Structure 1
């Protein structure tokens, strides 16, 4: 088809860009193709596309972006119940939404880079563009710090993060996945990216994040999390088993409770683990 190809094309011009933003761009672009003038036909065709896209890419971010797009179309449906000017106004609002989501990363970096002090040691788990941007803005602010990255045994992405950080002239250091407890005392704060924010405040991240959060809680170490707004998902896992199996697939993801998180840096502002629930309730997604 065209959905698969367009998704892969948007993923390929810029590797940097996340999967959910690319999926939202593909959905809005396919919205221009729509010929049916009935609302359930538009709804079902687009929902089919979002499920197929989610099948292609097993990630929580893609599903979150799809859920947000359907909720935004439902609001634009409660506009007038028209689907005559509704498609037009919806396209404009969607373009505005895309431009706004583009600046999310810069807003998160400019808001989170202030919590890093000169001479402090940072502890990161895996590669993430958001934490990389935060660190680049901190070093851009005439700051000096040391970073410890976990190798991320499932896929050697921690080494990629360390390479991209050492390229910015920062004394990075790679540690073993089993050494997260040995270097926890030599870290002043922990900053990691989140793949998806659950209803209560927890985060769905790489398999090696919950144990690090546990060690941080055991040593009173600030555990900060950086994530965008399009990663908010209406899930409520009670333990490591309540997480959907489609997101885990040696699992590739785990859930972290909000009691182990100190603060959250999102494009909407710096928030606590409980404010995200209020935001999700306000959206009624």
Structure 2
């Protein structure tokens, strides 16, 4: 298959199901490309896969896609693969890729099960922007006969907080929507902060939607816990120091309007990943172990 077919399949897979992330679409497209490659060589296959990953990353600029592709490439090659016949090796890597795809789809439930027990009874929870994993966590919590109240932010400039509130309406939980500049005013009434993630970095910090750094600083100024929910296939190799060091291909999407910002590890309390519950110091070597 060619580049145009690649992009068409990618966009069709993304459009078919709105309840689906970019990483899974990229992985499925890469598997489809693997199942339709011809030739008798390993280096040719590697070059084709690298070119496909590059042209897929070109279309959409999100951190998870590159990490998912790299992890896919590393994972499918961790076996014997010596033999003598191309076909046997091809079937072996196809089976490995299918097993990897099966494994990926079983992390949200584990995260929800591990994280739902940290919510008290009759508590106020502040959150930011839209994230499906937080919605799953709250659904699991409300299925356990608990009560709480939720605050959200309008999340300029696309107003995703209103969509999050509308989704929260069906769960008959009290929900309030505040302005994007009233975080400091509203921090007093809150008890804990739960946010999503877009990519986990080496030193322990995170990369997320613009507007998280100020919330973290304000929460730290009043001694409130800060919780983060992330996924295994979102760990990327990068060691930023300040806000300038972030690569430009993630800052500006395809007057200044940056889209993402990075938060340091000294302003976070716990991380709830599918590997378990980790302090920020555990990521520094869990990432090393993961990228075998």
TM-score calculated relative to the size of structure 1: 0.95
**In structure 2, do the counterparts of structure 1 residues 64 and 79 end up closer, same or farther at CA, with 3 Å as the change threshold?**
farther
What is the alpha-carbon distance in structure 1 between the residues aligned to residue 126 and residue 262 of structure 2? 19
**In structure 2, do the counterparts of structure 1 residues 2 and 212 end up closer, same or farther at CA, with 3 Å as the change threshold?**
same
What is the alpha-carbon distance in structure 1 between the residues aligned to residue 23 and residue 115 of structure 2? 22
Corresponding residue number in structure 1 for 2:265? 258
Native 8 Å contact 1:64 1:196 kept in 2: no
**In structure 2, do the counterparts of structure 1 residues 173 and 72 end up closer, same or farther at CA, with 3 Å as the change threshold?**
same
Q: How does 1:1-285 map to 2 (within 5 A)?
A: 1-76=4-79, 85-249=88-252, 250-284=257-291
Q: Which runs of 5+ in 1 are unaligned?
A: none
Following TM superposition, by how much is the alpha carbon of 1:80 offset from its aligned partner in structure 2, in angstroms?
A: 7.1
What is the alpha-carbon distance in structure 1 between the residues aligned to residue 266 and residue 173 of structure 2? 31
Q: Which runs of 5+ in 2 are unaligned?
A: none
Bigger Cα Rg: 2
What is the alpha-carbon distance in structure 1 between the residues aligned to residue 86 and residue 116 of structure 2? 44
Native 8 Å contact 2:68 2:234 kept in 1: yes
What is the alpha-carbon distance in structure 2 between the residues aligned to residue 106 and residue 50 of structure 1? 29
Following TM superposition, by how much is the alpha carbon of 1:86 offset from its aligned partner in structure 2, in angstroms?
A: 2.9
Following TM superposition, by how much is the alpha carbon of 1:94 offset from its aligned partner in structure 2, in angstroms?
A: 1.3
**In structure 2, do the counterparts of structure 1 residues 79 and 254 end up closer, same or farther at CA, with 3 Å as the change threshold?**
farther
What is the alpha-carbon distance in structure 2 between the residues aligned to residue 14 and residue 82 of structure 1? 38
Native 8 Å contact 2:30 2:49 kept in 1: yes
Secondary structure of 1:98 counterpart: helix
Native 8 Å contact 2:76 2:96 kept in 1: no
**In structure 2, do the counterparts of structure 1 residues 179 and 37 end up closer, same or farther at CA, with 3 Å as the change threshold?**
farther
The C-alpha deviation readout for 1:6-28, integer Å capped at 9, x for no partner, is 11122122111111111111111
**In structure 2, do the counterparts of structure 1 residues 92 and 132 end up closer, same or farther at CA, with 3 Å as the change threshold?**
same
What is the alpha-carbon distance in structure 1 between the residues aligned to residue 205 and residue 138 of structure 2? 23
The C-alpha deviation readout for 1:107-156, integer Å capped at 9, x for no partner, is 11111111111211111111000111111111111111111111111221
The C-alpha deviation readout for 1:205-224, integer Å capped at 9, x for no partner, is 00111111111111111110
What is the alpha-carbon distance in structure 2 between the residues aligned to residue 229 and residue 148 of structure 1? 28
Number of residue pairs matched by the alignment: 285
Secondary structure of 1:109 counterpart: helix
Native 8 Å contact 1:77 1:83 kept in 2: no
What is the alpha-carbon distance in structure 2 between the residues aligned to residue 83 and residue 239 of structure 1? 48
Report runs of 4+ in structure 1 exceeding 4 Å deviation: 76-84
**In structure 2, do the counterparts of structure 1 residues 282 and 81 end up closer, same or farther at CA, with 3 Å as the change threshold?**
farther
What is the alpha-carbon distance in structure 1 between the residues aligned to residue 113 and residue 287 of structure 2? 24
**In structure 2, do the counterparts of structure 1 residues 252 and 108 end up closer, same or farther at CA, with 3 Å as the change threshold?**
same
Native 8 Å contact 2:71 2:291 kept in 1: no
The C-alpha deviation readout for 1:8-64, integer Å capped at 9, x for no partner, is 122122111111111111111211011123222111211111111112111111111
TM-score calculated relative to the size of structure 2: 0.92
Following TM superposition, by how much is the alpha carbon of 1:69 offset from its aligned partner in structure 2, in angstroms?
A: 1.3
